[PDB]
């Protein structure tokens, strides 16, 4: 699967889309994912959550009109979601967070 910072960052700026192992939260729930039981890997084998819009209300990510932030989970294999996310924009800017969106650093 493609689910590393560099792998997803590079796929995204190229293909302008997420790798095929990503599914949205509502998609995952439709299949039976229940966040409380950390069972993603049981109902959606080899899938990661990714593609949901990140609103950016604590203004920490660079704002602009026409720009939309989207997030994807990084390094997940199974169990409960980790704290790693890739935050990507409409204009292909790429940021990462390894602390549940407290702090962000630019990667692309």
Curated annotation (Swiss-Prot):
At the top level, the lineage of the source is Bacteria
Give the record's GO CC terms: extracellular region
Give the enzyme class.
hydrolase
The active site of this protein is located at: 71, 100
What's a single GO MF annotation on this record? RNA endonuclease activity
- Which keywords describe this protein according to UniProt? Endonuclease, Genetically modified food, Hydrolase, Nuclease, Secreted, Signal
Q: How is it used?
A: Introduced by genetic manipulation and expressed in male sterile maize and rape by Plant Genetic Systems and in radicchio rosso by Bejo Zaden. Barnase expressed in transgenic plants will specifically destroy the tissue(s) where it is expressed. After cell transformation, protein expression and plant regeneration, the active nuclease destroys the pollen producing organs thus rendering the plant sterile.
Give yes or no: UniProt keyword Flavoprotein: no
Tell me where it resides. Answer: Secreted
The record's EC number reads 3.1.27.-
Similarity annotation: Belongs to the ribonuclease N1/T1 family.
Q: What does this protein do?
A: Hydrolyzes phosphodiester bonds in RNA, poly- and oligoribonucleotides resulting in 3'-nucleoside monophosphates via 2',3'-cyclophosphate intermediates.
Recorded protein name is: Ribonuclease
């Amino acid at each position: 699967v493609i689910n590393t910072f560099d792998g997803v960052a590079d796929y995204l700026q190229t293909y302008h889309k997420l790798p095929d192992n990503y599914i949205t939260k509502s998609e995952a729930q439709a299949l039976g994912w229940v966040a409380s039981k950390g069972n993603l890997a049981d109902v959606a084998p080899g899938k990661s959550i990714g593609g949901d819009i990140f609103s950016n209300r604590e203004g920490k990510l660079p704002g602009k009109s026409g720009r939309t932030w989207r997030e994807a989970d990084i390094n997940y294999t199974s169990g409960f979601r980790n704290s790693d996310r890739i935050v990507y924009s409409s204009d292909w800017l790429i940021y990462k967070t390894t602390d549940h969106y407290q702090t962000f650093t630019k990667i692309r």
